[PDB]
Design an enzyme around this catalytic site. Structure first.
Site, PDB file in Angstrom:
ATOM      1  N   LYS A   6       0.857  -1.179   0.000  1.00  0.00           N
ATOM      2  CA  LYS A   6       0.000   0.000   0.000  1.00  0.00           C
ATOM      3  C   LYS A   6       0.886   1.220   0.000  1.00  0.00           C
ATOM      4  CE  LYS A   6      -4.513   0.886   0.303  1.00  0.00           C
ATOM      5  NZ  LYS A   6      -5.532   0.067  -0.416  1.00  0.00           N
ATOM      6  N   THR A  66      -4.533  -5.095   0.977  1.00  0.00           N
ATOM      7  CA  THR A  66      -3.716  -3.896   1.103  1.00  0.00           C
ATOM      8  C   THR A  66      -4.467  -2.844   1.965  1.00  0.00           C
ATOM      9  OG1 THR A  66      -4.506  -2.817  -0.923  1.00  0.00           O
ATOM     10  CG2 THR A  66      -2.695  -4.423  -1.158  1.00  0.00           C
ATOM     11  N   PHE A 177      31.532  28.034 -12.075  1.00  0.00           N
ATOM     12  CA  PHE A 177      31.674  26.816 -12.860  1.00  0.00           C
ATOM     13  C   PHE A 177      32.524  27.128 -14.085  1.00  0.00           C
ATOM     14  CE2 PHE A 177      30.137  23.292 -15.668  1.00  0.00           C
ATOM     15  CZ  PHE A 177      30.690  22.272 -14.918  1.00  0.00           C
ATOM     16  N   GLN A 243      28.985  19.299  -7.625  1.00  0.00           N
ATOM     17  CA  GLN A 243      29.795  18.141  -7.219  1.00  0.00           C
ATOM     18  C   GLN A 243      30.705  18.500  -6.034  1.00  0.00           C
ATOM     19  OE1 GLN A 243      29.013  19.076 -10.372  1.00  0.00           O
ATOM     20  NE2 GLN A 243      29.584  17.517 -11.906  1.00  0.00           N
ATOM     21  N   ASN A 269      20.392  20.727 -10.529  1.00  0.00           N
ATOM     22  CA  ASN A 269      20.736  22.096 -10.849  1.00  0.00           C
ATOM     23  C   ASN A 269      19.559  22.773 -11.524  1.00  0.00           C
ATOM     24  OD1 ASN A 269      21.910  24.547 -11.579  1.00  0.00           O
ATOM     25  ND2 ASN A 269      23.728  23.600 -12.464  1.00  0.00           N
TER      26      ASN A 269
HETATM   27  O1  LIG Z   1      -6.859  -7.041  -6.352  1.00  0.00           O
HETATM   28  C1  LIG Z   1      -6.631  -6.747  -5.195  1.00  0.00           C
HETATM   29  N1  LIG Z   1      -5.517  -7.178  -4.556  1.00  0.00           N
HETATM   30  C2  LIG Z   1      -5.275  -6.873  -3.330  1.00  0.00           C
HETATM   31  O2  LIG Z   1      -4.245  -7.280  -2.803  1.00  0.00           O
HETATM   32  C3  LIG Z   1      -6.156  -6.112  -2.598  1.00  0.00           C
HETATM   33  N2  LIG Z   1      -6.185  -5.625  -1.344  1.00  0.00           N
HETATM   34  N3  LIG Z   1      -7.283  -4.888  -1.190  1.00  0.00           N
HETATM   35  N4  LIG Z   1      -7.979  -4.916  -2.364  1.00  0.00           N
HETATM   36  C4  LIG Z   1      -7.288  -5.662  -3.246  1.00  0.00           C
HETATM   37  N5  LIG Z   1      -7.522  -5.981  -4.536  1.00  0.00           N
HETATM   38  O1  LIG Z   2      27.834  22.456 -10.972  1.00  0.00           O
HETATM   39  C1  LIG Z   2      27.720  22.090 -12.131  1.00  0.00           C
HETATM   40  N1  LIG Z   2      28.047  20.811 -12.470  1.00  0.00           N
HETATM   41  C2  LIG Z   2      27.953  20.404 -13.687  1.00  0.00           C
HETATM   42  O2  LIG Z   2      28.266  19.240 -13.953  1.00  0.00           O
HETATM   43  C3  LIG Z   2      27.497  21.244 -14.691  1.00  0.00           C
HETATM   44  N2  LIG Z   2      27.297  21.092 -15.987  1.00  0.00           N
HETATM   45  N3  LIG Z   2      26.826  22.218 -16.503  1.00  0.00           N
HETATM   46  N4  LIG Z   2      26.701  23.149 -15.511  1.00  0.00           N
HETATM   47  C4  LIG Z   2      27.156  22.542 -14.363  1.00  0.00           C
HETATM   48  N5  LIG Z   2      27.259  22.932 -13.077  1.00  0.00           N
HETATM   49 CL   LIG Z   3      24.415  20.668 -13.715  1.00  0.00          CL
HETATM   50 CL   LIG Z   4      -4.870  -3.432  -3.963  1.00  0.00          CL
END
Ligand SMILES: O=c1[nH]c(=O)c2nn[nH]c2[nH]1
Ligand SMILES: O=c1[nH]c(=O)c2nn[nH]c2[nH]1
Ligand SMILES: [Cl-]
Ligand SMILES: [Cl-]
Ligand SMILES: O=c1[nH]c(=O)c2nn[nH]c2[nH]1
Ligand SMILES: O=c1[nH]c(=O)c2nn[nH]c2[nH]1
Ligand SMILES: [Cl-]
Ligand SMILES: [Cl-]
Ligand SMILES: [K+]
Ligand SMILES: [K+]
Lengths: 303, 303, 303, 303
Positions: A6, A66, A177, A243, A269
């Protein structure tokens, strides 16, 4: 591959036990979390060889719905007596494996749904409200946990990782950079002073997974502290690339937190294009949004 | 209807003249903006009877290219010597009508692109950075302006409105919604204590349009102040509905700012569904996200 | 202003009465709607002076809960015996005002949630499925209706409009944009052959509101036919601008549907930037996504 | 981990060499692609040990600017003489490693940007337009390719996968979900006839990587064919769960395409909640959108 689960299980708990006793660092005012409001978005994935016939034969005998996993997670947030998302995932994982013997593996992702303090005035004085919070769509804490049942029926955590996601930082000057490859494919001019705008997702792993839970809070590493290290390092550094920056953020994190084993970065970035380079009687300039393509970098620093 | 224009004209300026001298109120310590970074998203719409043949005949003779409107806006942000979005829109409007005699009407929307301060350490002392900012996806200021060229060639502002958009506030307790109509269509239970979660968009108009420009900052009403009023009133009020809340926020705004003529609210209800009502030895509860349908309210309060 | 209501009221109905008996046009093969699956997203707004104290005093006595409005809409989709979203809105509006005598005005927006036919093999051949549908996130029909209760207790429709939203069309050649103003704000080159990419939202208004309901389906104007007129006219036309194009689309709509009073366009320009102009041995070129600012045009064509 | 690159590199090409000579299957009328308009969104990631000092020292000597990578990809779309996104990725990868000998690995993701045919009237009849296309936000093809430079400067493909993303299918009847675990966490009722709504992402891997390129097009597996198998199998099957359905779809894919090694599914459940189960004098019902949490299933079928 064979699993199911879930996603987008939102759960909001009021009055979770507060996180206190967290070691402060010079980069950050963070000391803990009041937890008046605690929100998490959980994804649960489970697996096990005994699930096979649910796929191959349409046999639902061993299918935990679930929908029931959703109920399980929400009920466990109510009974959780700890103080962190990391610890909450461990509680859920252990509990689920204890409940359902046919499940051999569980993987959980938890993403904080962050709220910020607001202020109110009472009898002439303005103070933080204990009732009203602002939902933030900015950066948020994350946690990941995978747990398995061994053949001797012991349960083992096989992966744990914490993180901060959605941090968007722009530094208006003090970034270059230059010196990159110039060949037939290069049109980018060298820039000795750009307003570097980076998105950061930062993840860390602890030397000892128990430290992630917050049970001994002095060993817990808060996403808020990581945020404030990142902004401080960005400020301090005459950056030479993204980096270069992320390596230095990583080094500072590992220095401040010797209990961490590694820090992993995913950066993008988003630096603006310059439109007006000089404004009379001002140091100001005008920029605008670039075309869609964005650079990205991925790097791990280890302790 | 007959107009055309350019949307999503992002423009970022460094070192705009700071807004200083704003009159404070009890709900807010806001006094101004440093304007190290100033971001705006502009939409420009223009009209005039002389545009007719651009549509009816494909005659581009009197078409200012929408790309050129974008250039116009970006260049004017570089030359703008004022301190507010409202003022900037007036500058662009007046400038555009002075430039292009065949245009009879201009509408502008400006939306703030907000940035927040971050922390950095120098000599062990953590302070706000003057270099590094955090892009915020939370609430933001807005401004609207319509200007027309009259038959005597005078230029007149026919509408002006300022605003705050994207404010998302949750109050965990001290809210009720009871006493509404119960008939064949009503399934909602009465709730004497709900965690009311509202989205607020708040817009104000000034008695004198000139006060919106910020040229006399004592008369300027900052979106940050409106934000802080909204949070304070929400905290203070045992709410009886969102309708009840927004009326009270409105009244407080008009009390604090007698230079305003009206405040207009568009609110939405996003209150979570309750899952766990009682937690042993705790005041806490657990909630989750509702189904998609959302309530909304729209209301004007006048001075 | 004073109103409140519910948005994002999704409702999906199976086996609505089919729409047939429509009047065809040369540009479109459209011959009706099967209505095995009918989805609508409804927004309802209601107003009336008797709602004032729900705001000014927190008195909820005359408040129909927004949750009850949602129930009302969903229940009425079940009992609706007509064939169009426009007719559904009239049914909801009339029914709501009849139920709630203290409400003076109701406004409704309905947006189609469109689904597309899929095919299946059974009994030896591949044929359109009567069971499996594909959810489409492309263009969709819209409808708008406002109704008021007059002082004498009678009901009147006060505005009705139909539309098509989300149409995104690119014509790879046979478009020019030349002859526009070239001055100190112009950097856009003239282009005698561009791959014009427009987003179109088209709204129409009938002379007789009854023709919108589908009760005499020969008088109905279907969004599918409007879509087909738009694509045909775009293909047929050596476009000189978007302005030029939308006028021609509007003229064609009004010629094909004499029962319409007017048609309103909101268009946006999303034309790609050129990267490679010449490719050895081919007529092809390469383009990419532009920066975010987009041109737009708003234009009404009337009979 | 250590890599960097460019995302959202959009490139649109007109008149790519058409794909024809494909091998048909019963479920699909697919017979090729015209390629009048061909759009792709590419993400490129590169790595290699020689990039270390770009991070550790801020040395950009061996850095190909990400902007240059964008140029490289766009220019290669102009010169590409093949017929598939998979082949385009191979062309880019091989070319890039040949150009930059210090790069050890390149990963590429390509996503189709899909367009649909429109119709126009000309010369007396309505026919498919060779000029006007509709941009689709529905399902789209995908491709993945990773390539490495070995010690001897030879190149090898190290991973290749093709796919179909964004398929959203609802089947109105002929689906059950019964017989699942009913315990203290279960509130889901059994349902012998639900309107199952699934999101599907389907990925396939070829036994022989060469078959993915289109060079011998009879061995190519088209996303359009996979889509048509999914819809046919969904229609044909009295489904017992999503798990049960995707297994059957997978088996059918592998039966139809013996040149495939395996097929991987990621499915999500978005089935509507029922509001009205019985409508007078109709087989119809009314449903609405559920709360946000969604079930998902992940499963691989192998030959
Ligand atoms: O198809 C289903 N699988 C599940 O495991 C499930 N659990 N609640 N409802 C469900 N329906
Ligand atoms: O900090 C940066 N790392 C990168 O690898 C990079 N590539 N383009 N600009 C950048 N700036
Ligand atoms: Cl980058
Ligand atoms: Cl489910
Ligand atoms: O504050 C509220 N106003 C309303 O109109 C309403 N309707 N349902 N719930 C509601 N809450
Ligand atoms: O069709 C167009 N109309 C316009 O007004 C315009 N401005 N720039 N490009 C344009 N294209
Ligand atoms: Cl509401
Ligand atoms: Cl335009
Ligand atoms: K026809
Ligand atoms: K066939």
């Amino acid at each position: 591959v064979m699993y199911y689960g879930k996603g987008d299980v939102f759960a909001y708990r009021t009055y979770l036990k507060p996180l206190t006793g967290v070691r402060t660092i010079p980069e950050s005012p963070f000391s803990g979390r009041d937890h008046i409001l605690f929100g998490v978005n959980v994804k649960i994935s489970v697996g096990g060889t005994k699930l096979l016939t649910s796929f191959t034969k349409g046999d639902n005998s061993l299918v935990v719905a679930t929908d029931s996993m959703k109920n399980f997670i929400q009920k466990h947030l109510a009974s959780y007596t700890g103080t962190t998302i990391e610890g909450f995932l461990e509680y859920v994982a252990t509990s689920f494996l204890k409940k359902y013997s046919h499940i051999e593996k569980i993987s959980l992702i938890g993403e904080e749904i962050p709220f910020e303090t607001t202020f109110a005035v009472k009898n002439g004085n303005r103070a933080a409200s204990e009732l009203v919070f602002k939902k933030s769509r900015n950066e948020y804490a994350t946690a990941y946990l995978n747990m398995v049942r061994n053949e001797d029926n012991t349960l083992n955590i096989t992966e744990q990782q914490s993180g901060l996601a959605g941090l968007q930082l722009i530094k208006v000057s003090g970034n270059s950079f230059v010196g990159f490859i110039r060949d037939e494919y290069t049109t980018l001019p060298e820039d000795s002073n750009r307003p570097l705008f980076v998105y950061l997702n930062i993840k860390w792993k602890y030397k000892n997974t128990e430290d992630s839970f917050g049970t001994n809070p002095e060993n817990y590493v808060a996403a808020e502290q990581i945020r404030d290290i990142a902004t401080s390092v960005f400020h301090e550094t005459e950056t030479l690339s993204i980096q270069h920056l992320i390596y230095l953020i990583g080094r500072r994190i590992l220095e401040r937190f010797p209990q961490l084993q590694e820090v992993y970065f995913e950066s993008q970035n988003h630096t603006w294009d310059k439109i007006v380079e000089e404004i009379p009687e001002s140091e100001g300039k005008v920029y605008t949004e670039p075309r869609p393509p964005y650079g990205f970098q991925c790097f791990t620093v280890t302790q």
